[PDB]
Subunit: 494 residues, 4 copies
């Protein structure tokens, strides 16, 4: 069932959100927000800067003070507010999905069925952790009672990307709030709108003022303001590896704020000769082309055993040739635009290198339409490892297919990158599945599938693909600060 909105969407929420109220910017400047499919302005939004990030942090610091409503409420009540927020997002599913699709150039079917479902489910998962975050009692040497508290860290700055604005906002605020933190969120400059609606719903749900504050604006101003702030306890960021380094660096020079990063990838698949060929083609295809390739985990290097390489390529190219480009909102459309010009250019520039450096172009390889940031779906075969398209994250609808005949060698090739976000392994053989997945330097390894992500599973990168994990039980650790309390006693007993 794909239901839709009955009325034109009206943009209501466009201001900075601090202490459960709407603020104009300290400058009074606003900034435009566009539709990537039309290149038309959708609205203007208040533009946040350091001056406004400062107001947001003070609000967050105050809401985090010992004795506040957010610090003193039962953990179960933090959970209740989170499940209430999920019910509210569910109520506004049609509206939010349309806004997500229209603002982020995202297929509406995906937006409604996938993004909004994952968003609701992830919130509900996190709600359930709130009163199940526990410390320890510890049999310390000597006559002492020792326990630990897994406290909230404090004010967490959270920079959200444009590829999955709602899902990534919830991946960040869900755990942070479940653990009792307060947050200052900076949505992507390209995609501030759905977060501002969520803020309206955070107010409606009854979170105490200052527990969530949302500051739209630009990265090198409001984002830098966050990453360099002297009273922000932790920064979480998803985006390019290049910007990741700037954030980690800025944390070090400012106040040694804790850092977690979810960054790019150049994620490989290894397809063995004994693999279910059709299943491998389908997952590797969707693996790289999903949301116009604008996925951190994009299966951007597909290594296929020589004896099935030809047949793999052929079937892959056929599947790539089936797309219908156009407005994400129109039913039947199966590929939307890229998010913006900066991105559009890098992608076309990378496609050019593919041709020049002599990969075999099977289909695509140029732009589409008179407007919108559209790129034809592109497939390159006979790709080699020093080629730009084999080394650089494209973040576009561009697939690389390469051959191998030696398993040891292809695992070295798969591992020979500074990235390490994810990988895929396609085989029917028990031993190979286990041993190859073990040998890959990748945070998530899929076997006989790709792109399977859920709230129950921790997620993050090896190497320059990230620091830390998000979600699952393990990801919840990075929103706590552990305090050990050791009490002198007259005599301990086991």
């Amino acid at each position: 069932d794909l239901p839709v909105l009955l009325t034109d969407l009206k943009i209501q929420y466009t201001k900075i959100f601090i202490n459960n109220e709407w603020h104009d910017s300290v400058s009074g400047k606003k900034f435009p927000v566009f539709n990537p499919a039309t290149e038309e302005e959708l609205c203007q939004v208040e533009e946040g800067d350091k001056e406004d990030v400062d107001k947001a942090v003070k609000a967050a610091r105050q809401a985090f003070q010992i004795g506040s409503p957010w610090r003193t409420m039962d953990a179960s009540e933090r959970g209740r507010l989170l499940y209430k927020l999920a019910d509210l997002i569910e109520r506004d599913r049609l509206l939010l999905a349309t806004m997500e699709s229209m603002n982020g150039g995202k297929l509406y079917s995906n937006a409604y069925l996938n993004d909004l479902a994952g968003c609701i489910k992830t919130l509900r998962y996190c709600a359930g952790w709130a009163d199940k975050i526990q410390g320890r009692t510890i049999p310390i040497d000597g006559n002492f009672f020792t326990y630990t508290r897994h406290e909230p860290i404090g004010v967490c700055g959270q920079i959200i990307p444009w590829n999955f604005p709602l899902v990534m906002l919830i991946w960040k605020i869900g755990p942070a709030l479940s653990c009792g933190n307060t947050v200052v969120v900076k949505p992507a400059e390209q995609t501030p709108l759905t977060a501002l609606h969520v803020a309206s719903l955070i107010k409606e749900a009854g979170f105490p003022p200052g527990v969530v504050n949302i500051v739209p604006g630009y990265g090198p101003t409001a984002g830098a303001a966050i990453s360099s702030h002297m009273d922000i306890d932790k920064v979480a960021f998803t985006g390019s590896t290049e910007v990741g380094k700037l954030i980690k660096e800025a944390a070090g020079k400012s106040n040694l704020k804790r850092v977690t990063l979810e960054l790019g990838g150049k994620s490989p698949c290894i397809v063995l000769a004994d693999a279910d060929l059709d299943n491998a083609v389908e997952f590797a295809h969707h693996g790289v082309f999903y949301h116009q390739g604008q996925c951190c985990i994009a299966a951007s290097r597909i290594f296929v055993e020589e004896s099935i390489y030809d047949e793999f390529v052929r079937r892959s190219v056929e599947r790539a040739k089936k797309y219908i480009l156009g407005n994400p909102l129109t039913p039947g459309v199966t590929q939307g635009p890229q998010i913006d010009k900066e991105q559009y250019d890098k992608i076309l520039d990378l496609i050019e290198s593919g041709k020049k450096e002599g990969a075999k172009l099977e289909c695509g390889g140029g732009p589409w339409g008179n407007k919108g940031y559209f790129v034809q779906p592109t497939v390159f075969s006979n790709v080699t490892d020093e080629m730009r398209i084999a080394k650089e994250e494209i973040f576009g609808p561009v697939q690389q297919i390469m051959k191998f005949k030696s398993l040891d060698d292809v695992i070295k090739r798969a591992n020979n990158t500074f990235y390490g976000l994810s990988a895929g392994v396609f085989t029917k053989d028990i031993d190979k599945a286990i041993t190859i997945s073990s040998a890959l330097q990748a945070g998530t390894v899929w076997v006989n599938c790709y792109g399977v992500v859920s709230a129950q599973c921790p997620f993050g990168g090896f190497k320059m693909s990230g620091n830390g994990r998000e979600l699952g039980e393990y990801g919840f650790h990075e929103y706590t600060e552990v305090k050990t309390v050791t009490v002198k006693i007259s005599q301990k007993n086991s």
Copy 2:
């Protein structure tokens, strides 16, 4: 029982340790190592630089390769090697304690009874975790089998401080090795000798070559080489907050290597009127004066309720006046020297500010002897919060005592620093103990004691006192990298 060595100590191990063999430096340069109590040179040691750190990392990378002895051995066998190392250190306890005392200016009674005991015990604790590091099986949405592996991260660079050379070496290598990592260790320039002996014992115990490599030398050369290295997966460092920032910053600009830091403090005690006065005086005294004040957790601000302030000061000053300064090796001596000139000067300079800014000097306040870096034990009363001695980590034998009459206010004062390593709370009242320890922004809070540290308890700072925790169950997390494996299945069942 305080037994001692029967023979003059001979310095045997003075070279760089890589692949279980002894290397001269790539330059051929050596550097001197002094006794802080005599200011005499004890020996020369091979001087490591970037060029040698490079050799050490390659060794560590190779020993970490899939299919290596260190990667393939049973976890229980990693544990066995660690308990073997502990037995070997125990065998060489007299020798090691003497070397520690002579090189680090550390009282021999402490060195033998405390440092070496904690060292053996911490190793044995860590040995026990090795085959008890576990991932999870996870009930992911959809028809998939999902599990996680808590893998070793890889090559860990470990920079060790001079205040507790053996204990901190074991606090770092114990967990790192228990989890299956390989290490490149840089002992302090001041105190490389006991680590080089431990390396001899690592070879004797039979660790595979390249699993532990030790590179003595200077911080701004070999330390920078570590923190900026492109194939080092993680850096661990204990030391000043100032250098901590440089390390975190360098990680960001290089390869986004994971970072954990254990840094300075300006740790406060709050002594309530209802406290056991003698117990509070004793713990607060030893709390700040231990190892010549050269403790990250030094109880450097003692806040005493007004009605007992006078009596607290008097008793504190009496206890401070009981010390016998001299050679750490001579029995009966109860205060050794500071570690070196850089430190000696900063401390005297900070004592001068105390006098100028008008704290009340109860005793001490100048140097001692014709040689050695000795500082008289110093007590300041009527200290105020803007005074240098109240804000800056002194890392010397200097105690600050201040009064309070308002509990809310004194907790704000206790929390009003960028540090947050530890704190102490002295009271007999159940409610106050729990509520004050909860409100302190400090990683370890002691109640009716101070300085109680053990392998079972995680340890680290809030704020600019550190990132991460060491030891306990929780500290073990930071030497693992979590990998999620998600396998497509025909149908799952609970």
Copy 3:
């Protein structure tokens, strides 16, 4: 806010619940259900026997089969059904509380504000555990991949008591269902009605048929049928210790079904001379008198230090003399009836022993009214340890107060019973709180409070007060069965 029902309650659900449908008994026999406050019949209910328990187990076995909807649905969806059930109970709060009050002789204010709140909250807690139940990956010796599955056990028989019919039904079915088990529930013969309504709501919420089956009837027939059944995997029971032994015994002789038991107590409080006297009197009072003493954890022995014993007794007797006996439904009424004749008699018989064996009766000591099972609230001072009232669980509104002057001795006295469900310790002193709570042989120890029970906290007895724990993280273990899977591999790597 104490809102109430606007219309006469109508009893709708009175049949056996199997496969989401309503069954008459195989015999066709029904049995009466009474109001303990009037002694009037409220209705008749279908009477379950072995023959009907058999139908229920077959339904539960089928719903547990590999490949069923309950086995294959996402864990998160088990959670969703549970939170849906909680919303439904919340919707029917007025109705359910009235039914609980009218059937179980339970004060309506309590029923509405406490029982129904705990019921909703506990369900929501359990919903949150469903997709957070996880096994392990284990670094086994040798070349193997080993993981564990924490599976549901299977068909769980659950015998519910009459004192807290709704709360105990949810304490049992919440965890059982969250973990993926199927259940055959036997509500108390006295109080089957609220469970039958809940079953209607389980159908409405959309649980698959056979996942929950409810068989009202008698203990020595339907209860024995459960405890002795050859295809029931586990039995959970709350009630008398005496019946507990019969159940455990029957499990052994039948099919070695797993057993958890929550049984009686003779729970002591130790009140120290330094205690907040008013707080101790209040909690110890409510501790024993709550729900007409019909609490497993009833604070039935209160040990007060001699120097405050007199004053403790006086204040306790004053508080006991303030009750208003009558219909649980009438506002202002503060004590309802006991549940039935069997219980009424045992209580009066135990009050008689109190008088005969020469305890000092401060107030109460006889029955009340012309109808209903009412007992005057009774206080006995100068109670000694061999007295019946000091040894036997009364399960009535009868308080025992005894003196002590030696702490070591009173802890031996507190521990000198075969029971061990709970205890209370009242003092302001940190050391005494910790050391006494450690030395008590009791599953839950309260300090400066009593009767504080919540879903987050595991609960159960030492000794003959129970086997196992319910709720919290730990209680969830007893509704799982651990399976280890060990897979041969060519080579493992850490």
Copy 4:
């Protein structure tokens, strides 16, 4: 390397062990101990009865008292004593293995290389858990601080079987002691000797008196005395399911002592057509024949897919025909005797049913030698499900091989028993391995192997094969008793 003892073994330890001293029996009766391979008496041992079990429990109760050395020592020191015991067993490896072989009819190569290795390794694993047993801090609703203590339960009675006397003694006492319990052990009547030696080593290692007490004697006297004792907190037992029921029943009628049971099996293997045939034959063979079939997990029903059934049988029969029967001590001997007459008879009686009920005898089927309890290794093909040999645990060297062609059906057949200790699955296919292992009602499922057991992995049965798990992290739970402590506070903060 198979080294051996240089001198005749001398039996030294033959008395009851209580409070680290050697007791004659209260009766003065002794009982004989035989060599199953010669049928000659090896010695006499003091015979324990209820009267002696009583002395042992009082010792254990006293050593468990609050304030005792065992209750107050650091957990790390419990660990140290355990690793000391392991070193001592290692020192006496030759002696112990010879005694095990001579007393238990166990091949010396196995005894020395397998039993004693597992014994040392399991002790060392358990030593490592001692100071890593931890409770929780819990975010309870309302203004309370709640923590849990995972205490030792208390006096644990531990009944050890004759098949693996040393390994099972350590599987029981290792965890029990690591958690801080005291134990009263009853070794098998057939095999008391190695346990009595271990007791000598427990004294040597310096465990406090009364922490371990060993009472040799008979099951229906000393075993019943344990299972029915009113001051024994828990009973652990490995043996027949039939006796298991008696124990569980007796616990219920006495003092509701906690129970864990590790019992028989009729464990199946499913061998798929795509399996590595030679690997399946080898593991299934050793799976059932190991230690003369005297294994709870004996692979006693082997289901092979029809198209490989013939070839599987042939290869299996060939491997069975290769044994050399004789004295377990003589090198080259590959099959020892069964343990005793009771067992010998049941096995021969079960082999007779095999012939009568018309299974196809491939080899074996009668006794061997003029003395010793020897049974020829026996293989039966064309076995059907109602045959005695397919339903009853034989506990002898007798293999059953049956065919299947339907996977759904063979899984029903595999699951159609009241047992459920273990199972094996042989296939190369990822999906089948996971889905079949999930569908088996068995506590341990091996894939492409069999009989792989280690300290890191929890172990126990589904159904009538056991209650509870031993070893791994999970098994450690069953030697703790959880106590919740809930403290009233003025205000909580997250």
